[PDB]
Amino acid sequence: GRRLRVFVATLGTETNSFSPLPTGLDAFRATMLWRPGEHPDFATEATGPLWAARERAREGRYEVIEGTCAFAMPGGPVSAQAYQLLRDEILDQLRRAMPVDIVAFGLHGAMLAFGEDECEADLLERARAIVGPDVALGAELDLHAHLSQRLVRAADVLVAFKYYPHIDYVERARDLLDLLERIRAGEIMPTSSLFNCQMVAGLATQSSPMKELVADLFEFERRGEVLSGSLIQGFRAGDVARMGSKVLIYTNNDQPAAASIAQDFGRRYQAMASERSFAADIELAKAATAYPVILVDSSDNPGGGASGDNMALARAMLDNDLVPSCIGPIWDPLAVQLGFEAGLGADFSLRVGGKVGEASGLPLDVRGKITGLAENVTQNLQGSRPPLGRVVCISTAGLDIIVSEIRDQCYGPDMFRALGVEPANKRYVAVKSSEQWRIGFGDMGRSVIYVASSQQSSIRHYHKRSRPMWPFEPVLEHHH
């Protein structure tokens, strides 16, 4: 009758192997570095397992032991020192918590660190070394993860997000805990299968053809044909052998049935597999007649690991007279400092962006006036308020350039309004974002143009990616 004992912790990030930006402890602190007891009373996509356990503890069926919850925004690989420090802190907490019955981790699945290409398996395997084989070890994962057979063997069960945009974190956690409970009570013996679709492909879960595949997977779980099923869309920017789109199926003591079901959903994904220049996109933009027009620099979306400091669209806007216009948020902490030292109303030259690496392009020399200075701009992201920090607006030839000291994407038009710019009255509103800007902008846009990279000539060189993989190379074998 003892309330089951359940360890919960979180360590994760979406590594862009091509980002020159580091993901150290500073980064985890900028987004999430909550040590035991510091986790707020609001849910996070990375801390789902803890939330449902807290809930089941209120229900009086669980005694949560909480460890460090760490998460960092998309960037380059984690430093060996940072990953090691957080990994060992969480593992020490698990030791001090012994004895436990269920261990449930919130992980991403695509965290790459220097010296570790299988970080999630390391943590889970180093966990079983302490808990033993009779404790239920499991983890929640982002569908943008890198699944390996090593990771599947490192845990009793792994449950991933079913939805992108990622909405189902708490519900997937409840599913994981339910399964981990049945595994502890010896009511279920998990048999698993991982199918490599030999492809890296991504589709939103709310539109066809993916909506029906995700639904059919939920139906198999409800009908009990599968204990749990996860479609791993993957993260193309992780240069690692485990990268790729995959399907993971678990069944109750029927591994052949897992392999068939996994193969069926994986071939449907392979079938759902469905050239553009920067200049053409700027020409298309110059042809727009319905304002406001939203220009999305998805190539420089910080939410995908980009630095958010490429100034090609800003340069193209001023050269092709795409004004009145606004652009942001651009990451140039030095430029924020210099604009602040100059003062509101100052007409001066500022070098903006082009500073982190080669994907940032050459900097833009702007002659303009400081038309805005804000000390702590924040935006509304799913109830939360992630900061832009000190922010500057410099206005040049009709372009209002918003520069931030904290790197982030644009989540709506209030970040520009904070600096005296009204995006609805603009001809063109350029955002460093991909799809999450649509949260706050709503119906403001009469047209949207996803802008291509100004550096399509610079090709990504992968060093550890599995070949053949789509769409990098043709795949002509499916039987081994």
Added chain:
Amino acid sequence: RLRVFVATLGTETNSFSPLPTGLDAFRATMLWRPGEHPDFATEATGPLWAARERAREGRYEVIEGTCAFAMPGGPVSAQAYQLLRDEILDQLRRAMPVDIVAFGLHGAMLAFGEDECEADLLERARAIVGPDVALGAELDLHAHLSQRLVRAADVLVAFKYYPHIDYVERARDLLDLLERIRAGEIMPTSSLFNCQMVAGLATQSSPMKELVADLFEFERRGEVLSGSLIQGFRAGDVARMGSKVLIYTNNDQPAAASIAQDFGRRYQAMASIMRSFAADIELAKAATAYPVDSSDNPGGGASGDNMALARAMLDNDLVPSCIGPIWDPLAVQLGFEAGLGADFSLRVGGKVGEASGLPLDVRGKITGLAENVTQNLQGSRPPLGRVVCISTAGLDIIVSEIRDQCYGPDMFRALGVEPANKRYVVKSSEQWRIGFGDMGRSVIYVASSQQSSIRHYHKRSRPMWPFEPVL
């Protein structure tokens, strides 16, 4: 005892520097509120020193106001100019009645929103004291002289020498003229002659010394009450910028014009008396000698990040080699996050402003990490802050979180670097020798690759030599 108010607000503004001048810049050089001017003289506080002395003599009651000066940099913030100008003007109000007001000004302070800082400050001073208080200022010969400034003060006296060594002597000359004006012995009449040119040369080189010696001659023989040759500062995009000659005569304006016209025309004659990055790259590329990029000296207001030099070194393969103290705070954040002996790519330089040039992309293995480096300068230990070292192909790069010039080769040493062993070796113009002496045989003053880049003056008067031909 005559009541004399003394204060200083000054800076030599370079309109082409990307680093704005705010209170911080003044606090790091000279922000001495009333009662804090030390027992040593400065080139910006001539009037106060000369007064304090004349106070000992027992003829003056000096009321000292804020003495504020800043290192060479970009325009001053409007918020800072107003705070310092209004703090000073309030001290004069709280000190009335007074008989003489003497400011140590530079003359080439440009602020965002204000092109006539000195005249504005003088005009606001005139508004509080009245027309019967003797109001004057001392200025640098590298100043921007306007007729409005000449109208703003009863008399202005500039440095006569450069290197500037007469500040104290010029102060006594100014206070004297004011002490007289206050009495009524002189009714100063003046003329400002525009040389329609910008240039100048050491007062120890000819024919400047002669032009200066002749001017001192007029002073002592009495023909001119006070004379000043304003060489000017080309790096200030402001209409008042340029070389000019100002003559003072006792209630005789026509005489002033002729004297000013005489000295001025002469100044223009010396114009002739008053050059390739690559040309220099070759001279260095000889290696005859076993062991400055002045264009990028932090001491003169440059950001210290034009990596054109370092890029030319890897292109010439001038290694083994040393780079200098480079200001790229971010590069520091990254090099450290990488860890010691980290062979990773890092964008360094070309980040502060237009004069910083194209950044340098290098996957150099970092070879040094420091948490609080410092150099030794005349009893001061200026910080470099967090520091990193990175080697690519024989060249080692030193990146600092704080912008400072290289003083001694000890900085390179804290990063496992002995500049002596290197065949080629600094972010400095001349103060490097205070730690280098002659550890190296040859010395090449690298020119600016930005020579091609033409500062785009916006408010500069036209036409003006040497930019445009004149009549």
